[PDB]
Structure 1
């Protein structure tokens, strides 16, 4: 079913953001596992897989709308080098992602693509849940101290 050109462009922009996140979260997960921080490693693995699920739905919607999913352009991964930096890098990425989701929803509404809007709203709910997790972890580091925070994430 032929979709709106600018809707497809927005969906590809969102997809691009998801693809950055998949790789950033996967690498952060394996860094945490290598360091023995297995609870963080496991949680971050699940974040990567969740982003994969959103990317899948976007690819499927773009193809239904007769557009070309762009999996070729990979933007800048924000790779941290210690736990605090990695969490902040994930948060910086998620805040860019939600800005782009809101702009995409505005356009879907304007052109009456209510099904694409609903998909993007579901993704936005997941991304806000991730922001909640990240803000909470950064706050816990302050409240319990970094050494205790890391200790609590050694064991699954």
Structure 2
């Protein structure tokens, strides 16, 4: 079913974002495991699977709309070098992502692609939850102290 050209562009933009987040979060997860923060490495691993699942849904939507999913153009990974910076890097990406989700939803609505809007809104709900997690983690570092924070994520 031929979709709106700019909807497909918006979708391919969100996909771009999901593709960065997949790589960024898989690396942070394997970093945290390598440092012995097993509980963070495991949580971050599932945040990366979630983004893979969003990508799958966006790729399927684009092919159905007779577009070309663009898995080639990979933007800037935000790699942290310590725990707080990695969580902050995850948050700065998710916030870039949700800005682009709002603009894409705005446009689906103008062109009446109500199903693409519903799909993006479900991704946006997932991303807002992840923002809530990340912001909470940066909160706890402050409330229990960095040493305690890292101590609480050594084991599962």
CA shift at 1:116, angstroms? 0.2
Residues 26-83 of structure 1 show CA distances to partners (whole Å, capped at 9, x for unaligned) of 0000000000000000000000000000000000000000000000000000000000
Uncovered stretches (5+) of structure 2, i.e. residues with no partner: none
In structure 1, what is the Cα distance between the partners aligned to 2:35 and 2:113? 46
CA shift at 1:3, angstroms? 0.2
Tell me what 2:109 maps to: 109
* TM-score of the superposed pair, with normalisation by structure 1: 1.00
CA shift at 1:7, angstroms? 0.1
Deviant stretches of 4+, over 2 Å: none
CA shift at 1:96, angstroms? 0.3
In structure 2, what is the Cα distance between the partners aligned to 1:8 and 1:59? 10
CA shift at 1:117, angstroms? 0.2
Uncovered stretches (5+) of structure 1, i.e. residues with no partner: none
Q: 3-state SS of the aligned residue for 2:15?
A: helix
In structure 2, what is the Cα distance between the partners aligned to 1:25 and 1:121? 21
Q: Paired residues, what number?
A: 156
Alpha-carbon RMSD = 0.2
Residues 69-112 of structure 1 show CA distances to partners (whole Å, capped at 9, x for unaligned) of 00000000000000000000000000000000000000000000
Q: How does 1:1-156 map to 2 (within 5 A)?
A: 1-156=1-156
In structure 2, what is the Cα distance between the partners aligned to 1:131 and 1:86? 13
Residues 101-154 of structure 1 show CA distances to partners (whole Å, capped at 9, x for unaligned) of 000000000000000000000000000000000000000000000000000000
* TM-score of the superposed pair, with normalisation by structure 2: 1.00
